[PDB]
Structures are given as C-alpha cells and as structure tokens.
C-alpha cells in the first residue's frame, strides 16, 4: 500500500509539580507530525504554533465557553485524574530483582565482564554502582541505560570491565525509591 | 515535573484507524477498544481501582476524524512523511535454560502509527501466547509499540522480531539467541 496517509493527532497534557500544588495543562493539536495550535494554561488562550493553526486559535479563542472549560482544566481534569489513579501510579513501588553473573567482552576471552542485572522495578529512577573489596569502581563501567519494558516495569544491566583475581569479591549496589537502604549483591571469583 | 499524565488520540486516513489512550510517566494506563467500544486497562488490577466511560473517547475520535478532514483540505492534501522505526529485541529478565522468560520487541520512533509485527521461532511465524500494546506517545510525537512472546529458553531455538513499516524498503528483523 503506497497510498498517501493523513494523520490527525492530539494530546491533553497534565504536568504536576510538588504533588498537585503546582499544575500546568497543555492541549496540543497536530497534523502529520506538525503541531499547529495549542492551549497553555500559563497563557489562558489558544495560540497558533504554525500559520496552518491560526484559523483555529482565532476561532477557538472566540468561544468563551470553550476557553473557560480549558481554564478550569487544571482542577476539573488534571487534579481530578491525578487523584483518581494516585494509589496505583504515583504510589506504585516495585522492588528490583538484583543478580550478578560473569560475561565476556568477546568470545575466546576469559571472564572479563561482570554484569549486574537490575530488573522488574518501578518507578524508573535507579542508581547502580560497582565496588571491589569495599572500594567503588568508577572506571570501565558500561550500561544499557534505563530500559522500559512497556508494562509498568523497568530494567537495566550495569557492567564492569575487569580482570578478576583469585579471592576478589565484587559488589553491586542498588538504590531505588522502593527501599530506604541500598541493596547489595556479591560475586566471587573462583 | 514530578509526574505527567497525557491523554493521546489520533485518527488516520485512509486506514480509518483511531486510538485513544492515557499515559502516566511513559506507561499506558488504559486505551479504548474502538471495535468493542470498551475500556482496556494496561494492568488488569487497574480496573478494580478506577473506571472510565469509553463513550467519551468515541466522541473525541469523531472530532479527530472531523478535524482530519478539515486539515487535509487546508494543507492541500500533503501526505505524512514516513519515519521508519528502530527495533530492539530483549528479554525482561536474564535468561536461564528451561526457565520461563519473555521476549520483548520494542518498536520505536516511527510514524504513521501502522506496523506489521511477526514473531519468528527458527524462521517460522509463532502466535501462541503473543501479546502487544497499542501505539504509545513520545515527546517528539513519533510512536512506540511493544510486542511480547513468552518462551522456554533453549540452546536449539532462535528468535526474530520481524517489523514491516511503509518507511522501510524491506522488513526489519531483530534477532535473539541464547548467549554463552
């Protein structure tokens, strides 16, 4: 199918700061990936983003009932919907699963890569550090970055490039909002 | 911000496809099944704590459809530019032989929101236990999508996520096999 496509897209966005103490509402209208008109509660009226949206900004700003709907949206829509799902979104906390396993930077190599897997957690904010014999390892650390699984869970792999010596103990340390104390997992060279 | 809630909706011609969904900090809270005219919660448990009138979404889609017709005329029938997706295949947890796991196919940064996705096991299409998300919003207004395939890890099975998009010259295949 090589027929031309035409896409009409719109978002109604609620931005929350310090709980619901500060709230900003944005309604945005798009056509073929181009935003052409928006309402920003900071302004209180529609504004054209591009010339193609100018007729609608003017038309919509002439409708007092529409504007007052949008001006009240931070309360009737944003703060309301925030309250509706607060218990299972804002207060959602899922403990990370933490495991450590050895790997290789390339085949035909000795085990020279330590992988700290941190998975299944929520929210996405996480902090993972490596230690060797009680000292933080800041060099040779590479990671997948934060990975979203698309199902209200996240994961990450934090890897340490190192050459383990006999008797060395490596520790992966994890901080996450679901806990008030760091999680630690040890790995021992055989 | 500390949190962001987004109601995202689109209507697409000539496919006549519409979608309506709520997003919380990047995750889907729910979408509306246009066919069944029903609310679909991303996690089953959500439905026990909250509700939503799907008829409100259908009304917005009707507006989006009307607005599309108006914009298409105004822009002189300028077609959307295809932006082909990036695809990543991964597991949701470290793989252990004979330990049940889930393959994830992440389709990202594309538009229009139309895609054909096929899971392949050893080159053969597999549909058992598969699932998928609707099209999810991005800050750059491109889309993302997740496909899932539960599986029993083995050394004798390889996997591919095959993705078709009008922005691609050929199907894009992302591979997975057991790591040594």
């Amino acid at each position: 199918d090589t027929r031309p496509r035409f896409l009409e897209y719109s978002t109604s966005e609620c931005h929350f700061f310090n709980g619901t103490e500060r709230v900003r509402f944005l309604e945005r209208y798009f056509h073929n990936q181009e935003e052409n008109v928006r309402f920003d509660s900071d302004v209180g009226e529609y504004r054209a983003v591009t010339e193609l949206g100018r007729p609608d900004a003017e038309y919509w700003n002439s409708q007092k009932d529409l504007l007052e709907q949008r001006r009240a949206a931070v309360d009737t829509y944003c703060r309301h919907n925030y309250g509706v799902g607060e218990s299972f979104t804002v207060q959602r906390r899922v403990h990370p699963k933490v495991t450590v396993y050895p790997s290789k930077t390339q085949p035909l190599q000795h085990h020279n890569l330590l992988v700290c897997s941190v998975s299944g957690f929520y929210p996405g904010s996480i902090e993972v550090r490596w230690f060797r014999n009680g000292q933080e390892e800041k060099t040779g650390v590479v990671s997948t970055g934060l990975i979203h699984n698309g199902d209200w869970t996240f994961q990450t792999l934090v890897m340490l490039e190192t050459v383990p010596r006999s008797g060395e103990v490596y520790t992966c340390q994890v901080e996450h909002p679901s806990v008030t104390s760091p999680l630690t997992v040890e790995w021992r060279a055989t | 911000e500390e949190h962001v809630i987004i109601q995202a909706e689109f209507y697409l011609n000539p496919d006549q496809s519409g979608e309506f969904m709520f997003d919380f900090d990047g995750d889907e809270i729910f979408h509306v099944d246009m066919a069944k005219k029903e609310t679909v919660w991303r996690l089953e448990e959500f439905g026990r704590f909250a509700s939503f009138e799907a008829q409100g979404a259908l009304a917005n889609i009707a507006v989006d459809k009307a607005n599309l017709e108006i914009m298409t005329k105004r822009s002189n029938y300028t077609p959307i530019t295809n932006v082909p997706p990036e695809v990543t295949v991964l597991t949701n947890s470290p793989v252990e032989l004979r330990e049940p796991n889930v393959l994830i196919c992440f389709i990202d940064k594309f538009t229009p929101p139309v895609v054909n996705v096929t899971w392949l096991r050893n080159g053969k299409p597999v549909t058992t236990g598969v699932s998928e998300t609707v099209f999810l919003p991005r800050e750059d207004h491109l889309f993302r999508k997740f496909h899932y395939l539960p599986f029993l890890p083995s050394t004798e099975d390889v996997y591919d996520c095959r993705v078709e998009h009008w922005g691609l010259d050929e199907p894009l295949l992302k591979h997975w096999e057991f790591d040594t």
Binding site: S10, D56, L66 | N60, V63, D64, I70
Partner: peptide, 13 residues
C-alpha cells in the same frame, strides 16, 4: 474514581 476525558475542539471548517 472515574477518569475524565478533555473533550476535543472541532477546527474551523
């Protein structure tokens, strides 16, 4: 609780 929809506005014809 019940999630609210922000109705969409119809563009100028």
């Amino acid at each position: 609780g019940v999630y609210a929809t922000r109705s969409s506005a119809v563009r100028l014809r």
